[PDB]
Amino acid sequence: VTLCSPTEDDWPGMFLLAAASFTDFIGPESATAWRTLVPTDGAVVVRDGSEVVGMALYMDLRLTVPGEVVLPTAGLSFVAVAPTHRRRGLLRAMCAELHRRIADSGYPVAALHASEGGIYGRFGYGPATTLHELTVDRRFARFHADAPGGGLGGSSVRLVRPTEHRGEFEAIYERWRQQVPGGLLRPQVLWDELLAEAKAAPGGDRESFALLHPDGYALYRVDRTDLKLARVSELRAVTADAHCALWRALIGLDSMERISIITHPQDPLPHLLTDTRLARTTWRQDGLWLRIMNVPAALEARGYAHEVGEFSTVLEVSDGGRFALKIGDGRARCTPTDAAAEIEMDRDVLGSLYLGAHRASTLAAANRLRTKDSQLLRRLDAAFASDVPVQTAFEF
Amino acid sequence: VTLCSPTEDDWPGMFLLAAASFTDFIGPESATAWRTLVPTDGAVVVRDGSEVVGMALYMDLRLTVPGEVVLPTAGLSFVAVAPTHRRRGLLRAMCAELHRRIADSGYPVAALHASEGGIYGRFGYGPATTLHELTVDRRFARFHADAPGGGLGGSSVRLVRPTEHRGEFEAIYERWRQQVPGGLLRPQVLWDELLAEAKAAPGGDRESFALLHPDGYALYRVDRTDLKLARVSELRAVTADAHCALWRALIGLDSMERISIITHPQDPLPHLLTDTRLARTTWRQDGLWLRIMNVPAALEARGYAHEVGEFSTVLEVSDGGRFALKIGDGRARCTPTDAAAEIEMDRDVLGSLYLGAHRASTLAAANRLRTKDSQLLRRLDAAFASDVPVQTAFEF
Amino acid sequence: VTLCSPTEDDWPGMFLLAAASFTDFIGPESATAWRTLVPTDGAVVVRDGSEVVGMALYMDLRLTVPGEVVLPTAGLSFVAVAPTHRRRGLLRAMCAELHRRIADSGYPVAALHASEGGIYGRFGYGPATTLHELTVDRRFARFHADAPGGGLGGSSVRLVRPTEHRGEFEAIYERWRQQVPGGLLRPQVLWDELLAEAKAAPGGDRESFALLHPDGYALYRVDRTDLKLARVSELRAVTADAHCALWRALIGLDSMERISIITHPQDPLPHLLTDTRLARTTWRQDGLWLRIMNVPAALEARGYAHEVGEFSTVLEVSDGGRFALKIGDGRARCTPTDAAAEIEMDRDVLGSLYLGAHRASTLAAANRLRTKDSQLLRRLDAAFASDVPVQTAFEF
Amino acid sequence: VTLCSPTEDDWPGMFLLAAASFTDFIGPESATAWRTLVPTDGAVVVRDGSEVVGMALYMDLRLTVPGEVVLPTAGLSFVAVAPTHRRRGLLRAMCAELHRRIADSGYPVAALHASEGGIYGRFGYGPATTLHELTVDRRFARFHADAPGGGLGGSSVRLVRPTEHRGEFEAIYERWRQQVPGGLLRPQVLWDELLAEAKAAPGGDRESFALLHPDGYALYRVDRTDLKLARVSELRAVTADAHCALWRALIGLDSMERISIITHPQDPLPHLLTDTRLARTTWRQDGLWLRIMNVPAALEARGYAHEVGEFSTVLEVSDGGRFALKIGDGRARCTPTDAAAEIEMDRDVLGSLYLGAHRASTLAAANRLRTKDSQLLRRLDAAFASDVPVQTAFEF
Ligand SMILES: CC1=C(c2ccc(Cl)cc2)S(=O)(=O)N=C1NCCCN1CCc2ccccc2C1
Ligand SMILES: CC1=C(c2ccc(Cl)cc2)S(=O)(=O)N=C1NCCCN1CCc2ccccc2C1
Ligand SMILES: CC1=C(c2ccc(Cl)cc2)S(=O)(=O)N=C1NCCCN1CCc2ccccc2C1
Ligand SMILES: CC1=C(c2ccc(Cl)cc2)S(=O)(=O)N=C1NCCCN1CCc2ccccc2C1
Ligand SMILES: [Cl-]
Ligand SMILES: [Cl-]
Ligand SMILES: [Cl-]
Ligand SMILES: [Cl-]
């Protein structure tokens, strides 16, 4: 059993492993498109001794973090171990090799979407965004008097075919992703894939439509089995007017009983309606997971809340070093030290704090971060918070 | 049709209306116990012209708000209009009369639990706490290495009969409620009621048991139909050790598949486990609703976050006046002014901000609070936040 | 933490532990009745250091094994560890103490019903009977021309109240249990309990009725929620005529859609009908578990199939010794030896073979019993088989 | 209404009748492939008077029976009567004609799979194999210490594409079918059909994968709707090592919650696991049905258990004659006699005994076989039993 970078001849075997490992396997053609984001030496395989019995790779991504800072990010994906070779340490060996390559290549952070929640914490990844499914019973939905875009005249939203307005979606999404923590740059190939998913499939998904505003769009389709459910696959809005206008149009889908969307916990939708309860949370789960590869680079690159006054502390990451951390005027300086630690946490915990989705004091209450200073906790809560709520861009 | 305070002879008619209006009607005996919290002139009825066709009352409560400040609070309850007298303006008339009496009596706030989410916003109530149901598949649940109380020796938790340890539950709960925003004083009669609900009922609920720690307790029972589900009706813990220890014991219920609890969005439970996903959010809803009766009294009484630096603004509540609001050193001063408003919101919106459950910037994104200054929004978000997360005490 | 025999003062604490551990806890009064079968020193408890945090006991039973031989049998029951004291080795300590007492008292076998299937194998217990639920859609059920009791005249079965024919049920059951492997003597107190379960409960089970034949009876009741399902709680028949007659009567329950029974895999019911498929197997599970305490006493006491010719072998039980085993003329002699083993198995595997419910060759195919001689396997299969199929008497 | 052998021009009408009669109708192309197994004069049709209103045929098969003896077997299939011509005696007429041709052609046995369980007993067919669905919750599944193939090093199983390893599956299956009662020779055309079913269908079944061992294979696919269920369509293993290894790999399908298989009642899978209950029996049904066409040829051809000592009896089959039956040294001699019968049974009952799936004493308890000698019953039980458990090859 040996570990190495795959040659072109290894890819059919990798696709076989993938097809048997991921029920949602996107298939050879789509896999090949996403492959254009995998750098040279971004992939490892494990051959028996011959067929591939393990694989993993990362893609070159661009992640927005608080303060509208964009970080090069290694996006782990296509991770699989053959059902015949479980419990043999293959995942650990593959992850170790990739992390070495990712660190040596100069990525400050790595990221992934987790197939299960109990696997990646031990490799330093913490859940950093939260997915929130809202299901609206639109038959009762009525907008509040305060909601934007309620006046007389024409509507600002248009019902369109997705493939005919690619440029407008691209430009709107590019604006969104640069200003929202969790945003990812979506390259041309991923727009090819997205629009391909928009068309109907025989025995599969129904046709997708779009609602288009100058400052926002929604892509939706009727559910394949529940014909009174419309599923919004993606809603991106850059202003409050655009967000409200798009939801007015969606609630105008009179043939539907329910509209569902995977969104974030701070989606203002419930407050747009006269009955906030109509926007039911039907599902909650971790979204993006983060491993901080370089602690000082990551902590210095991020913007911090201006409201908290300047403060200094000493942070130890359980293996990843000890640092004097000074935060003031929305910026951090993070330098080596051997002074006594005031805060301790595992590497994964820092990932969970990093985008502002989890509060330091909540993690402290579970003893995932240790300190004897509750004032320090309040300061970390406040500093690491994000002005603009953390969102999830797209799964990879 | 006339409106007045009920006499003793009106109560049988009120119980009839209640039994037909609330499927969860606690019954005459329990209603009579809760009645001991209703002040003289705390109730109104509407007679036809004779039977009672409308009723409403408030109870004298004590609500903890951020900064561990306890406010006298009028708790609206037992609100009903006969199915024969709908759409006749009875609710509006009853609420107006009660609010007048509540304001004249000197309550700074009123509160309630809403039967539906679309009714009480127009009377000035905003949802101020959030209920979060977690369902844990305990068969996979394993505690993180970091979690408290994992070492060798004896356990600190005892399995006990609720009725034999009333004093210990009372004292633990009293500690909890004084330090947590949303906490309510639970008087002797409500402990009588709680322990009465603990016993089994023929054809009804099963017997309740308790898990008792020096600094926490849990009350639970097996679900009446799903015999592999244990429902935690109440878990109150004053330290992280107590909270973890109680959950270790609950996950030790080997005869169960699932443990469910109605808790709050910042419950650290998910982070106690090696797989955070096992703590599934199965339900989300508004808890306590708040109407601020006196804006300056309420805003001055509350503690504010020390992290935000001193700032001043002008707040208009849509009918309830305009105020110069100065916040600094964790305190507010709130005085009358005719200077131009920098922030505007309806009265209900202020209730939703008041305990820290909803962010000003989220409400702004729905246009429920209007300002042209985003720095001011960040400052309000930070100031109104609560060090200790907002929780829900008990339904009334 | 200490282990000892309970005093009278320990029983309230034991009932508390029981009520919290067994959702089907029969309650103090019934527990007290079953207690009459627990010998002096038949119970152990574990106190903290004080409350009981662990308990286990055995009852004095009489088990029929093949050849209509009745063995004194220690029936483990009421086994529980507090949810607060899991993973502390309490079960292992309690089982070790009880097994020592059971062995020293002279029981050749111990037995139990398992709450879960993965717990008791490591303590030497193997599943020895198989429960088979049959559900008959009686609306299509038609008896085969060959089936007994189809001729003209009066019926031999009577519809009766269970409490008025106790003596007849007792005598029929006593005949059944003496001739069927798996049969248990049912003492007077267990008949008191059975007939008490026969009456209706407010909000609980419906009233039970009986169908009575000179050589058989059935006890049944309509399901509490599914009113078109009749559940046969117990059917005991000593002749084929009685068994068929009782099923003719049950299929005569014209108000029902379905009749269900927990029976054994060799129940002839399917073959009584013109469509064997109508007797659907809706559930399959282990029934009685057996631990052979004394290998030679147990193997010598049992009758063996006369069809297999005399043969000799050497059997090793993984800890419980090595024996020269000679089987011929339906009898075994089983003596100590140090000669090379021809068959090896763990103690639990022998329990699974002992009543004839599992074939040696099936267990060999899972490598639970090791031999290099397939002729020996065939001989063991044949010898250990039971003329009269293995059944399950009652749960304890 | 006349009955005759179909001409080429009758087949479109037969396919129409088939498409309207079998919801699982394999379609014209597949029907045409299976047709290659139908001998000249192996089919009958009934025309109105013109369209076909009835049809039936048999295929030339090779069935393995105990003692690894292979018998030519007429496999009835494609049996249908038009919904317009029910209750007209068409089935009886078609079956009578085919049985005459089958008997005259020299087949000792005929066989079928029954659409319903109440139809074929009256034509002499008895259910002779038993299908057992096991559903494994693989998330809890852990192998016993005794289970084969648990040691260190590489795995012996490979994950492969079915179409690329046809030869290896063929050879493994050929070994299996020759040594297992119930085995059927699978000709080249049926391997063409099987591998065609392996590919994905748009709006239909998902792609199939294989797990390949030198001495065994499994074919499986994810369920089309339940994406956490993997269905094993076929598992064939010639050694215990191969069977265990294949199940280790299947339980290694970490993306699945459950693995299901249609197997037989003696599958050792449950005993491979530390918790035998995890292998849940979720479904039970008759598999292959057998009609013995020639009683002495069938009874003489079969091998019998060597364990039972030589014995003689007189068997009457209700229409099919009376015979002196002598069984000894694993062989039977079966000759005509007019001596008094000691055992009587219908022809279908003998089919149910023939492969060892049903015990003579179980059938006696339902009065489906009559004798006044219980020693004789024990001898028949033992003699007709099969060393190697009866299995079901493939449906036809
Ligand atoms: C984009 C994508 C793939 C892909 C394919 C080829 C290449 Cl070169 C790169 C990525 S995929 O793995 O086929 N499933 C994809 N998307 C669906 C949901 C994401 N899942 C997938 C399962 C899996 C497995 C380990 C780790 C994470 C996740 C997150
Ligand atoms: C404590 C209680 C009552 C009560 C009874 C008598 C007296 Cl004097 C005071 C309170 S109750 O109304 O019978 N239902 C109670 N509890 C159950 C859940 C609370 N629901 C109840 C329905 C209802 C109706 C309007 C407004 C709020 C809510 C919140
Ligand atoms: C008869 C009986 C009990 C009993 C009570 C008191 C005395 Cl002194 C003896 C027996 S019981 O434990 O309350 N549940 C009983 N019957 C219901 C089903 C049996 N279950 C029960 C759960 C359990 C727990 C460990 C081991 C086995 C089994 C098998
Ligand atoms: C192989 C096969 C057919 C076939 C087709 C053409 C020829 Cl020439 C021979 C066989 S089939 O009848 O179309 N359905 C087949 N298989 C599916 C399951 C089997 N069912 C089928 C329904 C049916 C109808 C009566 C008797 C038995 C069974 C057992
Ligand atoms: Cl989002
Ligand atoms: Cl709460
Ligand atoms: Cl039984
Ligand atoms: Cl099979």
User: Which ligand gives the minimal distance to the CA of C18?
Assistant: 3
Asked if residues B304 and B332 have their Cβ atoms less than 8 Å apart, the reply is yes
d(CA A306, CA A310): 9
Cβ neighbours of residue C153 under 8 Å, at least 6 residues apart? Answer: none
Which protein residue's CA is at the shortest distance from atom 14 of ligand 4?
D25
Q: What distance in Å separates residue C80's CA from the closest CA in chain D?
A: 19
Place of tokens 């509040």: A144
DSSP assignment of A307-333 equals SSPPEEEEEEETTTEEEEEEEETTEEE
Residue A61's H or E segment, with its range, is: strand A52-65
DSSP assignment of B342-354 equals SEEE-HHHHHHHH
Cβ of D157 within 8 Å of Cβ of A84? The answer is: yes
D242 contacts in chain A (CB < 8 Å): none
d(CA D150, CA B167): 56
d(CA D314, CA A215): 93
d(CA D396, CA D288): 9
d(CA A229, CA A261): 11
Closest partner residue to A367 (CB to CB) among B147, B265, B359 is B147
Asked if residues A282 and A288 have their Cβ atoms less than 8 Å apart, the reply is no
Closest by CA position to A46, among listed A72, A9, A14, A74: A14
Task: Output phi, psi for C314, to 5 deg.
Answer: -125, 120
Cβ neighbours of residue B152 under 8 Å, at least 6 residues apart? Answer: none
Look up residue B1 and give its DSSP letter.
Answer: -
The rounded radius of gyration (Å) of the Cα atoms in chain B is: 23
Cβ of A382 within 8 Å of Cβ of B116? The answer is: no
d(CA C108, CA C98): 14
| Token pair for B217 | 């307790």
DSSP assignment of B90-133 equals HHHHHHHHHHHHHHHHT-SEEEEE-SSTTSSGGGT-EE--EEEE
d(CA C136, CA C131): 16
**Kind of pairing, strands B126-127 and B258-263?**
unpaired
State the SS3 of A88-103.
CCHHHHHHHHHHHHHH
Asked if residues B220 and B258 have their Cβ atoms less than 8 Å apart, the reply is no
Cβ neighbours of residue A200 under 8 Å, at least 6 residues apart? Answer: A206, A207
Cβ of C268 within 8 Å of Cβ of D366? The answer is: yes
- AA letter at C190: L
CA A241, A246, A247, A253 torsion-angle sign: positive
Cβ of B368 within 8 Å of Cβ of A144? The answer is: yes
Most informative mutation of A16, A25, A44, A78 for ligand 1 (most atoms within 8 A of CB): A78
b or e along D179-207 (b: 16 or more beta carbons within 10 Å of the residue's beta carbon)? ebbbbbbbbeebeebbeeebeeeeeebbe
Taking CB atoms and a 6 Å cutoff, what residues make up the pocket around ligand 1? A 18, 22, 24-26, 31, 34-35, 38, 57, 77-79, 112-113, 115, 395-396
Which residue in C120, C217, C220, C323 is the catalytic one?
A: C120
| Token pair for D162 | 């079915």
Cβ neighbours of residue C175 under 8 Å, at least 6 residues apart? Answer: C238
Look up residue B164 and give its DSSP letter.
Answer: G
Asked if residues D70 and D62 have their Cβ atoms less than 8 Å apart, the reply is yes
Q: What distance in Å separates residue B157's CA from the closest CA in chain C?
A: 6
Q: What distance in Å separates residue A200's CA from the closest CA in chain D?
A: 12
Look up residue A244 and give its DSSP letter.
Answer: H
Closest by CA position to B288, among listed B358, B218, B239: B358
Place of tokens 């020299």: D106
d(CA C267, CA C261): 11
Q: How many CB atoms lie within 10 A of CB C215?
A: 18
| Token pair for A30 | 């789509």
Place of tokens 């192996």: D42
B249 contacts in chain C (CB < 8 Å): 83-84
Asked if residues D125 and D109 have their Cβ atoms less than 8 Å apart, the reply is no
Active site residue C396: yes
Indicate the resolution in Å: 2.2
d(CA A248, CA D122): 68
Task: Output phi, psi for D17, to 5 deg.
Answer: -55, -40
- AA letter at C58: Y
D252 contacts in chain A (CB < 8 Å): 82-86
Q: How far is the CA of C179 from the centre of ligand 7 (A)?
A: 13
Which residue in D169, D323, D384, D396 is the catalytic one?
A: D396
Chains D and C touch (3+ CB pairs under 8 A): yes
d(CA D308, CA D387): 13
Asked if residues D253 and D239 have their Cβ atoms less than 8 Å apart, the reply is no
d(CA B20, CA C360): 66
Atom index in ligand 1 nearest the CA of residue A24 equals 17
Assign B171 to helix, strand or coil. Answer: helix
**Shared fold status for C1-128+287-291 and C292-387:** no
Residue of chain D with shortest Cα separation from A12: D161
Which protein residue's CA is at the shortest distance from atom 14 of ligand 3?
C25
Q: How many CA atoms lie within 13 A of B54 on its CB side?
A: 24
Topology annotation, domain D292-387: Nonspecific Lipid-transfer Protein; Chain A (3.30.1050)
Cβ of C23 within 8 Å of Cβ of B202? The answer is: no
What approach was used to elucidate this structure?
A: X-ray
Whether D56 is in the pocket of ligand 4, judged by its Cβ within 6 Å, is: no
d(CA A188, CA A186): 7
Which CATH architecture describes the domain B1-128+287-291?
Answer: 3-Layer(aba) Sandwich (3.40)
Q: How many CA atoms lie within 13 A of B191 on its CB side?
A: 17
Closest by CA position to D58, among listed D107, D11, D7, D14: D107
**Kind of pairing, strands A343-345 and A311-317?**
parallel
- DSSP tally for chain A: helices H, then strands E: 11, 19
Q: How far is the CA of B164 from the centre of ligand 2 (A)?
A: 28
Question: Is residue A156 marked as binding?
Answer: no
- The size of chain C, in residues, is 396
- The size of chain A, in residues, is 396
d(CA C279, CA C273): 8
Most informative mutation of D59, D60, D78 for ligand 4 (most atoms within 8 A of CB): D78
Q: Where are the beta strands (DSSP E) in chain B?
A: 2-4, 43-47, 52-65, 69-81, 109-113, 126-127, 130-137, 158-160, 209-213, 216-222, 229-237, 258-263, 279-286, 288-292, 311-317, 321-328, 331-336, 343-345, 369-370
Closest by CA position to C206, among listed C222, C229, C230: C222
Asked if residues C276 and D120 have their Cβ atoms less than 8 Å apart, the reply is no
Question: Is residue D86 marked as binding?
Answer: no
Asked if residues D349 and D340 have their Cβ atoms less than 8 Å apart, the reply is no
| Token pair for A207 | 């046709």
State the SS3 of A104-163.
HHCCCEEEEECCCCCCCHHHCCEECCEEEEEEEECCCCCECCCCCCCCCCCCCCEEECHH
State the SS3 of chain D.
CEEECCCHHHHHHHHHHHHHHCCCCCCHHHHHHHHCCCCCCCEEEEECCCCEEEEEEEEEEEEEECCCEEEEEEEEEEEEECCCCCCCCHHHHHHHHHHHHHHHHCCCEEEEECCCCCCCHHHCCEECCEEEEEEEECCCCCECCCCCCCCCCCCCCEEECHHHCHHHHHHHHHHHHHHCCCCECCCHHHHHHHHHHHCCCCCCCCCCEEEEECCEEEEEEECCCCCCEEEEEEEEECCHHHHHHHHHHHHCCCCCCEEEEEECCCCCHHHHECCHHHEEEEEEEECEEEEECCHHHHHHHCCCCCCCCCEEEEEEECCCEEEEEEEECCEEEEEECCCCCCEEECHHHHHHHHCCCCCHHHHHHCCCEECCCHHHHHHHHHHHCCCCCCCCCCCC
Topology annotation, domain A129-286: Aminopeptidase (3.40.630)
Look up residue B151 and give its DSSP letter.
Answer: S
**Kind of pairing, strands D279-286 and B311-317?**
unpaired
Question: Is residue A80 marked as binding?
Answer: yes
d(CA A199, CA A190): 15
Those residues whose beta carbon sits under 5 angstroms from the ion ligand 5 are A 263-264, 391-392
First to last CA, chain C: 28
Asked if residues C20 and B159 have their Cβ atoms less than 8 Å apart, the reply is yes
Asked if residues B88 and B124 have their Cβ atoms less than 8 Å apart, the reply is no
Interface test with A, best of B266, B271, B281 (most A CBs within 10 A): B271
Place of tokens 């059951």: C173
d(CA D366, CA D349): 11
Asked if residues C346 and C368 have their Cβ atoms less than 8 Å apart, the reply is yes
d(CA B192, CA A128): 44
Asked if residues B264 and B389 have their Cβ atoms less than 8 Å apart, the reply is yes
d(CA C190, CA C30): 9
Asked if residues A390 and A356 have their Cβ atoms less than 8 Å apart, the reply is yes
d(CA D386, CA B85): 80
Cβ of D147 within 8 Å of Cβ of C117? The answer is: no
Whether C31 is in the pocket of ligand 3, judged by its Cβ within 6 Å, is: yes
- The size of chain B, in residues, is 396
Look up residue B138 and give its DSSP letter.
Answer: T
Cβ of D271 within 8 Å of Cβ of C362? The answer is: yes
Which residue in B107, B217, B354, B396 is the catalytic one?
A: B396
d(CA A221, CA B5): 55
Q: How far is the CA of D162 from the centre of ligand 8 (A)?
A: 20
Query: Dihedral angle at the C-alpha atoms of B267, B269, B272, B276, nearest 10 degrees?
Result: -100
Residue D270, burial from CB neighbour count under 10 angstroms (0-12, 13-18, 19+): buried
Residue of chain D with shortest Cα separation from C134: D284
B204 contacts in chain C (CB < 8 Å): 203
Q: How far is the CA of C262 from the centre of ligand 8 (A)?
A: 25
Closest partner residue to D249 (CB to CB) among A48, A83, A203 is A83
State the SS3 of chain C.
CEEECCCHHHHHHHHHHHHHHCCCCCCHHHHHHHHCCCCCCCEEEEECCCCEEEEEEEEEEEEEECCCEEEEEEEEEEEEECCCCCCCCHHHHHHHHHHHHHHHHCCCEEEEECCCCCCCHHHCCEECCEEEEEEEECCCCCECCCCCCCCCCCCCCEEECHHHCHHHHHHHHHHHHHHCCCCECCCHHHHHHHHHHHCCCCCCCCCCEEEEECCEEEEEEECCCCCCEEEEEEEEECCHHHHHHHHHHHHCCCCCCEEEEEECCCCCHHHHECCHHHEEEEEEEECEEEEECCHHHHHHHCCCCCCCCCEEEEEEECCCEEEEEEEECCEEEEEECCCCCCEEECHHHHHHHHCCCCCHHHHHHCCCEECCCHHHHHHHHHHHCCCCCCCCCCCC
Which residue in C304, C323, C384, C396 is the catalytic one?
A: C396
d(CA B26, CA D135): 45
**Kind of pairing, strands C311-317 and C343-345?**
parallel
Chains B and C touch (3+ CB pairs under 8 A): yes
Question: Is residue D332 marked as binding?
Answer: no
d(CA A216, CA A171): 10
| Token pair for B148 | 């408290």
d(CA C28, CA A305): 62
Domain map of chain D by residue range? 1-128+287-291, 129-286, 292-387
Interface test with C, best of B138, B142, B155, B212 (most C CBs within 10 A): B155
CA angle C62, C65, C69 (to 5 degrees): 75
d(CA A121, CA B274): 8
C1 contacts in chain B (CB < 8 Å): 154
Place of tokens 């590919």: D199
Question: Is residue A278 marked as binding?
Answer: no
Taking CB atoms and a 6 Å cutoff, what residues make up the pocket around ligand 2? B 18, 22, 24-26, 31, 34-35, 38, 57, 77-79, 112-113, 115, 395-396
Cβ neighbours of residue C50 under 8 Å, at least 6 residues apart? Answer: none
